[PDB]
Amino acid sequence: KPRILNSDGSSNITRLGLELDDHYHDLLTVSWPVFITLITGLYLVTNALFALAYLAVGDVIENARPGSFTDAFFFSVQTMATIGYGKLIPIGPLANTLVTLEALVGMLGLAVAACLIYARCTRPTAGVLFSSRMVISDFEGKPTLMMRLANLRIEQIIEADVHLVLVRSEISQEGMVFRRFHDLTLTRSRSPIFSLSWTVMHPIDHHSPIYGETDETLRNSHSEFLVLFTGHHEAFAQNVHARHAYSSDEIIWGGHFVDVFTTLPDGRRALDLGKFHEIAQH
Amino acid sequence: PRILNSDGSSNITRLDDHYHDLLTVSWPVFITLITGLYLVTNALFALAYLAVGDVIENARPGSFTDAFFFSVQTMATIGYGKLIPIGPLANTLVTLEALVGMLGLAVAACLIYARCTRPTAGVLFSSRMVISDFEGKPTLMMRLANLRIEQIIEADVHLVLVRSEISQEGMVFRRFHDLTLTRSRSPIFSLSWTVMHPIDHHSPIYGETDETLRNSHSEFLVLFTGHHEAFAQNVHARHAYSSDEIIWGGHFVDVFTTLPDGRRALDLGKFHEIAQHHH
Amino acid sequence: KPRILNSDGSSNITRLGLELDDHYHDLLTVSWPVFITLITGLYLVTNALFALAYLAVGDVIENARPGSFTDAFFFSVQTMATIGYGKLIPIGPLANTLVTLEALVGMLGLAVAACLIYARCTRPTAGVLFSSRMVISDFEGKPTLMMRLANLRIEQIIEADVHLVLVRSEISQEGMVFRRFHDLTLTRSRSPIFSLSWTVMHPIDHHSPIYGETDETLRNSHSEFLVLFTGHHEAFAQNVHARHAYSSDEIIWGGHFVDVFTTLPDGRRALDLGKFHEIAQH
Amino acid sequence: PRILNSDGSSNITRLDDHYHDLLTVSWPVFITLITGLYLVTNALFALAYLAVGDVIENARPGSFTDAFFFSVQTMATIGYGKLIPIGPLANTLVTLEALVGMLGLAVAACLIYARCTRPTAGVLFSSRMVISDFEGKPTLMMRLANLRIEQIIEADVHLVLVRSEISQEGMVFRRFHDLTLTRSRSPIFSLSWTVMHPIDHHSPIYGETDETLRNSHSEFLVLFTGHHEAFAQNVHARHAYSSDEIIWGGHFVDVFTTLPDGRRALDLGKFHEIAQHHH
Ligand SMILES: [K+]
Ligand SMILES: [K+]
Ligand SMILES: [K+]
């Protein structure tokens, strides 16, 4: 039984034409060492280009060796960074018109760097933990499939949403083995304030694709369970999310999630995450 | 005589707002405005020093050229040292010009940032819709795919039927009918997604045919939204179709093939292709 | 009949204790001339304070008249703005330790200014026009209350929401004249793409507080109709909104909104907003 | 033995993450980290010039003090002129130190901005709830008010009943019941808003009394959200109550009085006051 979705929810599927006009997407998605290099490489090339302009207009930099690329590059660097030490200064109106434009490039050039830097950083992780496996035990009468979610950080999550999806290959009346996504109704699909742990539950009633399906049936149909958390974290005043996927083998039947809440020796209620993935039997 | 273009924009010809206009203009036009505003502010500040003292050291007195380039180095905080202010009159404007170039840069980064953090959704739409039997019932279909490795969270498609009809009150107009999709929200959208509208009793296309849709100038509007993982931002895309854009009895070719190694790939070359009859 | 809500939707109601710890709210809400002044005044006071520190540590500025506040202020200004002309320079380690901290103040001080500037600006107006008055005419059988909304800008609005609310004073079983807000169901409460004009409609059926209420009844009960538009504008990639309120007198019965769409002499369909507030009779 | 505090935080004691930690720490601790990181970077760059050439002009050779203050003026782009680099070794680090202080400022503005654009909602909650007859039926009530002139758009209140109960499976736990308010969303919230929960057949408080709620350790959680006009940002507030926080048969005193001139005012001094019996 092949697995289509990874444990992180990513679809393990290649796409043709790996193969820049999507630059803004590329700039935000490349790694930080590559991003620092791109800004570094762009910075030296941009200073190397302005240097030639000072050399092409003639020796218009005092205290600069005529025709020396370094002094023009290091006057550009001192002009681009607005250091303006004082030894190397421009001469006449033409050099200053090249300096007044270079400073304009320095102002706008920094802002685009600040923009790219800012947008790359404000991507806060949700900081929520998923249960290693799913369990199906009776709850309030019906047999209920359930998985757990823990908030690792102290700050609470507002408007917490959970979306449990069963992805499974079925056959239609036409007669094709296509992949179909089923929404699994939950006892609770919205938690106003998510502080600690949230045990998501799917009652298996008349309205459930899992109804009447044994352990062998889920495995032989390549059944997988896609999970999506969404909320508004208080720590960032920003929206955060998390995804995860289970397979038919990762569900254990008759399992009972061990109580995460314990009682400390002192006499205060506490939360032990060491028993978050623990499961009991009945 | 089409009301909606294929991109979603309305065909109807429309017969200060500074903040909107700033982000509206193109990137070259935006770069020009900063330059002009930067030069004029430096030109005005040059006329300031010249029109109240003429204290710019190591510079031709009365020459605006030396004053503009001192104002530049002062607003651009270069401070070479050759051109230096003299007396309280120049030092007062130096303090003000500095306060100008600092607030002036912050507004520059503010406008630049707001213009680039408006990312495209990167979603491809089918060039046509198919009306065929899915599990017996005839269902109107159109599919979309993701053109980026990153996934879109909480993806919502909205399919709207735009057509011209006559009310009981005797006035003809154009109403927008919300089509009921089998799935209105996909929690994780990473590859391709086929959107289906079952044509049942409570369906505005129910009873219609190839001709009746065209005769009423029926048009179909699609709206996709979702939280893109690449940008940590809500992205959206739009598309529209007409009656002549539907191919009855069509089926979208399966875009999921298999590589020689054994890897499952997304064949987006067969995304717009549609075979008729049964397949 | 007194009016509680203004035409802009603002509640015309004073609140006690006009009467800073809510500074962040104050900084964003004060007017721009006041905001520029606050940053200006903070800038001079901050440069005047650093100047005294250079004077209190002793004459440690070359080419500066000893004990002169201006030269210390204008060295601070040249140090705060990082101009560094060259005549006025610090002397010894103590002056430079005061300069290395002043530059740190200049970096952080600019960012807070840039932050306040940015947050004050990214408040885009929705750019949507409301109909001057409401009309109640028959539509699809039932008598339907309706008002119009026009998109002034070219860019379309995504996920456009309209919330029509009837605010009215009623009496409960206890016997109190309180204000009550009624949600008026609409034929359409959501427009995926808002390009041009949107005619909101409230059918007056069995589920409507306006049902069985004449013109005289709405006026004698101080009835008002609060309207809220909400959407995601394409021009800003940001959420925009608008509010508005009508009164019982602003509704005209039997009115028929004149068609906003016309036909140009050329032969193309066009949209004339000159007849947006026009109303016909039947 | 209270599970939720009056602010909404859970009482349960909990038994790198750099980006979260940066915004988490207090404002004084945040200012310190920049200073330390700024000094150490200048100290490292000073050791750079000294450890490869010693070319800082007009400075005591081998003295770290003169090198730190040159590195500062170079990273802080002051460029007085007395201390100037000499040769390619210093000019190369000057170019790099400049690239550092420029990327270093941009991350500084990035972290500062993210920390202040997290505004408080500015919403006051009632210190207690009342269960009284509104239009006959007994309705649980709690009200909130806006402490700012600016209005909140699309305001949503969420009232949740937290209590400990036993399942049919014989295990005792704590379930969260969503209370059904008469109004879950207020489009425009500018003054005061009274939230009511009618106790009907489908109500978890139905049949309960003053004692049964306390005996089951019942607690009430409230969550307010909305789009504040002052910040153009979504603000939220939270609050919680216990069984002992309810006053049965109580009524909130009307907060809308009248001024001598004739103006209608919002009397927030009588916001928490509640009269019993009938009023
Ligand atoms: K500078
Ligand atoms: K400088
Ligand atoms: K200098």
3-state secondary structure D139-162: EEEEEEEECCCCCEEEEEEEEEEE
Residue B79 near chain D (CB below 8 Å): yes
Helix (H, G, I), strand (E, B) or coil at C157: strand
- Residue identified by tokens 């990273």 is D75
Residue C192 near chain D (CB below 8 Å): no
Measured in degrees and rounded to the nearest 5, phi and psi for residue A162 equal -125, 135
User: What gap in Å lies between CA A46 and CA A48, rounded to an integer?
Assistant: 5
Residue of D150, D141, D143, D89 whose CA lies nearest to D122: D150
- CB contact at 8 A, B251 and B279: yes
Label each residue of B33-83 as H, E or C.
HHHHHHHHHHHHHHHHHHCCCCCCCCCCCCCHHHHHHHHHHHHCCCCCCCC
In this structure, the number of other CB atoms found within 10 A of the CB of residue D68 comes to: 23
User: What gap in Å lies between CA A44 and CA D47, rounded to an integer?
Assistant: 24
Solved with = X-ray
Give the closest of A12, A82, A243 to B188, CB-based.
A243
User: What gap in Å lies between CA B44 and CA B68, rounded to an integer?
Assistant: 8
In this structure, the number of other CB atoms found within 10 A of the CB of residue A46 comes to: 17
In this structure, the number of other CB atoms found within 10 A of the CB of residue C273 comes to: 15
User: What gap in Å lies between CA D99 and CA A80, rounded to an integer?
Assistant: 10
Report how far apart, in Å, the C-alpha atoms of C15 and of each of A69, C12, D264 are.
69, 10, 8
Residue of A275, A173, A186, A258 whose CA lies nearest to A229: A186
Biggest alpha carbon distance in chain A? 90
Measured in degrees and rounded to the nearest 5, phi and psi for residue B72 equal -60, -55
Residue C67 near chain A (CB below 8 Å): no
Q: How far is CA C59 from the centre of its chain?
A: 51
- CB contact at 8 A, B10 and C195: yes
User: What gap in Å lies between CA A120 and CA D19, rounded to an integer?
Assistant: 12
C-alpha of residue C108 to centroid of ligand 1, in Å: 15
User: What gap in Å lies between CA B268 and CA A15, rounded to an integer?
Assistant: 8
Q: Is the dihedral of CA B3, B8, B11, B14 positive or negative?
A: positive
Q: Residue type at B233?
A: Q
Beta strands B264-266 and C14-15, pairing class: unpaired
- Residue identified by tokens 């399919």 is B159
What's the number of CA atoms in the CB half-sphere (13 Å) around residue A1?
16
C-alpha of residue A199 to centroid of ligand 2, in Å: 59
Helix (H, G, I), strand (E, B) or coil at D39: helix
Q: Residue type at D3?
A: I
Beta strands D274-275 and D251-252, pairing class: antiparallel
Phi/psi-derived region of residue C92, left when phi > 0, alpha when psi is between -120 and 50, beta in every other case: left
DSSP codes, D226-252: EEETTTTEEEEEEEEEEGGGEEET-EE
Residue D77 near chain B (CB below 8 Å): yes
The residues near B109 (Cβ < 8 Å, ≥ 6 apart) are A110, A111, A114, A115, C114, C118
Beta strands B274-275 and B251-252, pairing class: antiparallel
Which residue in chain D has the smallest CA separation from B109? D106
Across the interface, whether the CB atoms of A100 and B68 are under 8 A apart is answered: yes
DSSP H or E run through C93 = helix C92-121
DSSP H or E run through C117 = helix C92-121
- CB contact at 8 A, A82 and A76: no
Which residue in chain D has the smallest CA separation from A75? D91
Report how far apart, in Å, the C-alpha atoms of D259 and of each of A275, C3, C222, D193, D264 are.
61, 16, 20, 21, 6
Which residue in chain C has the smallest CA separation from D102? C107
- CB contact at 8 A, B37 and B107: no
- Helical spans, DSSP H, in chain D: 18-24, 27-50, 64-75, 87-116, 210-215
- CB contact at 8 A, B258 and B265: yes
Across the interface, whether the CB atoms of A103 and B31 are under 8 A apart is answered: no
Q: How far is CA A190 from the centre of its chain?
A: 22
User: What gap in Å lies between CA A105 and CA B31, rounded to an integer?
Assistant: 10
Bridge partners, residue D126, by sequence: none
C-alpha of residue D73 to centroid of ligand 1, in Å: 9
C-alpha of residue D144 to centroid of ligand 1, in Å: 50
Report how far apart, in Å, the C-alpha atoms of C133 and of each of C126, C129, C229, D127 are.
20, 12, 16, 42
- Helical spans, DSSP H, in chain B: 18-24, 27-50, 64-75, 87-116, 210-215
Report how far apart, in Å, the C-alpha atoms of A6 and of each of A10, A132, A177, B85, C217 are.
5, 13, 21, 66, 64
Label each residue of C178-196 as H, E or C.
EEEEEECCCCCCEEEEECC
**Chains B, C: CB pairs < 8 Å:** 143
**Chain C positions in Cβ-Cβ contact with residue A113 (cut-off 8 Å):** none
DSSP H or E run through B133 = strand B129-134
Bridge partners, residue B228, by sequence: B152, B233
Nearby residues for ligand 1 (ion, Cβ within 5 Å): A 82; B 77; C 82; D 77
User: What gap in Å lies between CA D207 and CA C28, rounded to an integer?
Assistant: 49
- CB contact at 8 A, C130 and C149: yes
Across the interface, whether the CB atoms of B77 and C74 are under 8 A apart is answered: no
The residues near A24 (Cβ < 8 Å, ≥ 6 apart) are B116, B119
Residue C82 near chain A (CB below 8 Å): yes
Residue of B101, D69, B74 whose CA lies nearest to C78: B74
Give the closest of B112, B186, B265 to A16, CB-based.
B265
Beta strands B13-14 and C269-271, pairing class: parallel
Task: Provide the b/e sequence for A220-244 (b: ≥16 CB within 10 Å).
Answer: ebbbbbbbbbbbbbbbbbbbbbbbb
Q: Residue type at D246?
A: I
Chain A, residues 92-121, CB within 8 A of chain B, namely 93, 96-97, 99-100, 103-104, 106-108, 110-112, 114-115, 118-119
- CB contact at 8 A, C130 and C147: yes
- CB contact at 8 A, C107 and B77: no
Residue of C259, C253, C263 whose CA lies nearest to C275: C259
Q: Residue type at D238?
A: R
- CB contact at 8 A, A180 and A223: no
User: What gap in Å lies between CA C243 and CA D229, rounded to an integer?
Assistant: 11
Residues written for chain C: 282
The residues near C112 (Cβ < 8 Å, ≥ 6 apart) are D112, D116
- CB contact at 8 A, B140 and B126: no
As given in the structure block, the two tokens for residue D90 are: 């210093």
Q: How far is CA B234 from the centre of its chain?
A: 11
User: What gap in Å lies between CA D199 and CA A49, rounded to an integer?
Assistant: 75
- Based on its alpha-carbon atoms, the radius of gyration of chain A, rounded to whole angstroms, reads 30
Give the closest of D79, D169, D176 to A78, CB-based.
D79
Q: Chain A: nearest CA to B195, how far in angstroms?
A: 12
Helix (H, G, I), strand (E, B) or coil at A52: helix
In this structure, the number of other CB atoms found within 10 A of the CB of residue B51 comes to: 10
Q: How far is CA C127 from the centre of its chain?
A: 11
- CB contact at 8 A, D230 and D204: no
**Ligand closest to the CA atom of residue C103:** 1
Residue of B194, B188, B193 whose CA lies nearest to B150: B188
**Chain A positions in Cβ-Cβ contact with residue B191 (cut-off 8 Å):** 11, 13, 15
Measured in degrees and rounded to the nearest 5, phi and psi for residue C74 equal -85, -15
User: What gap in Å lies between CA C39 and CA C23, rounded to an integer?
Assistant: 14
In this structure, the number of other CB atoms found within 10 A of the CB of residue A151 comes to: 24
Residue A4 near chain B (CB below 8 Å): yes
- Residue identified by tokens 């790996």 is A18
Helix (H, G, I), strand (E, B) or coil at A217: helix
Across the interface, whether the CB atoms of B153 and A230 are under 8 A apart is answered: yes
The residues near B124 (Cβ < 8 Å, ≥ 6 apart) are B144, B145, B147, B268, B271
Label each residue of A239-266 as H, E or C.
EEEEEEEEECCCEEECEEECCCEEECCC
Q: Chain D: nearest CA to B114, how far in angstroms?
A: 14
Nearby residues for ligand 2 (ion, Cβ within 5 Å): A 84; B 79; C 84; D 79
- CB contact at 8 A, A81 and D98: yes
User: What gap in Å lies between CA C85 and CA B84, rounded to an integer?
Assistant: 6
Measured in degrees and rounded to the nearest 5, phi and psi for residue B250 equal -100, 155
C-alpha of residue A56 to centroid of ligand 2, in Å: 25
In this structure, the number of other CB atoms found within 10 A of the CB of residue D269 comes to: 12
Measured in degrees and rounded to the nearest 5, phi and psi for residue C26 equal -65, -40
- Burial class of residue A183 (count of CB atoms within 10 Å of its CB; 0-12, 13-18, 19+): middle
User: What gap in Å lies between CA A169 and CA A176, rounded to an integer?
Assistant: 9
Q: Residue type at B241?
A: Y
Measured in degrees and rounded to the nearest 5, phi and psi for residue C5 equal -105, 135
Give the closest of D35, D148, D268 to C104, CB-based.
D35
Question: Which residue of D153, D156, D229, D278 is the best one to mutate when testing the C interface, meaning the one whose CB has the most C CBs within 10 A?
Answer: D153
Which residue in chain C has the smallest CA separation from D136? C173
What domains can you pick out in chain A, each with its CATH number? Answer: 19-124 (1.10.287.70), 125-282 (2.60.40.1400)
- Residue identified by tokens 């949740």 is D160
Bridge partners, residue B234, by sequence: B227
DSSP H or E run through C111 = helix C92-121
Give the closest of C82, C86, C235 to B77, CB-based.
C82
- CB contact at 8 A, B209 and B243: no
Bridge partners, residue C135, by sequence: C146, C252
- CB contact at 8 A, C162 and C128: no
Residue B243: DSSP 8-state: G
User: What gap in Å lies between CA A36 and CA B94, rounded to an integer?
Assistant: 35
- CB contact at 8 A, B19 and C270: no
As given in the structure block, the two tokens for residue C181 are: 């807000």
- CB contact at 8 A, A113 and D103: yes
Task: Provide the b/e sequence for D165-183 (b: ≥16 CB within 10 Å).
Answer: eeeeeeeeeeeebebebeb
Q: At what angle do helices A32-56 and A92-121 cross, to 10 degrees?
A: 170
**Chain B positions in Cβ-Cβ contact with residue D78 (cut-off 8 Å):** 79
Residue D79 near chain A (CB below 8 Å): yes
As given in the structure block, the two tokens for residue C90 are: 């610090």
**Chain A positions in Cβ-Cβ contact with residue D114 (cut-off 8 Å):** 121-122, 236
Residue of C47, C4, C2 whose CA lies nearest to C225: C4
User: What gap in Å lies between CA D119 and CA D223, rounded to an integer?
Assistant: 16
User: What gap in Å lies between CA C72 and CA C62, rounded to an integer?
Assistant: 10
User: What gap in Å lies between CA B71 and CA C43, rounded to an integer?
Assistant: 20
Terminal alpha carbon distance of chain B: 34
Residue D81 near chain C (CB below 8 Å): yes
Q: How far is CA C257 from the centre of its chain?
A: 29
Residue of A179, B200, D195, B97 whose CA lies nearest to C40: B97
- CB contact at 8 A, D191 and D146: yes
- Helical spans, DSSP H, in C2-31: 23-29
Measured in degrees and rounded to the nearest 5, phi and psi for residue B51 equal -85, 5
- Residue identified by tokens 């706008």 is A108
User: What gap in Å lies between CA D37 and CA D47, rounded to an integer?
Assistant: 15
- CB contact at 8 A, A224 and A246: yes
C-alpha of residue C56 to centroid of ligand 1, in Å: 26
User: What gap in Å lies between CA D113 and CA A119, rounded to an integer?
Assistant: 12
In this structure, the number of other CB atoms found within 10 A of the CB of residue C110 comes to: 21
**Chain A positions in Cβ-Cβ contact with residue D9 (cut-off 8 Å):** 156, 195
Measured in degrees and rounded to the nearest 5, phi and psi for residue A46 equal -70, -35
As given in the structure block, the two tokens for residue D6 are: 């009056």
Measured in degrees and rounded to the nearest 5, phi and psi for residue D63 equal -85, 120
User: What gap in Å lies between CA B104 and CA B37, rounded to an integer?
Assistant: 10
Q: Residue type at C216?
A: E
Which residue in chain B has the smallest CA separation from C140? B168
**Chain B positions in Cβ-Cβ contact with residue D77 (cut-off 8 Å):** 77
As given in the structure block, the two tokens for residue D32 are: 């310190």
Residues written for chain A: 282
DSSP H or E run through C73 = helix C69-80
DSSP H or E run through C219 = helix C215-220
User: What gap in Å lies between CA A89 and CA A61, rounded to an integer?
Assistant: 5
Residue D227 near chain A (CB below 8 Å): no
DSSP E strand boundaries for A8-142: 14-15, 128-130, 134-138
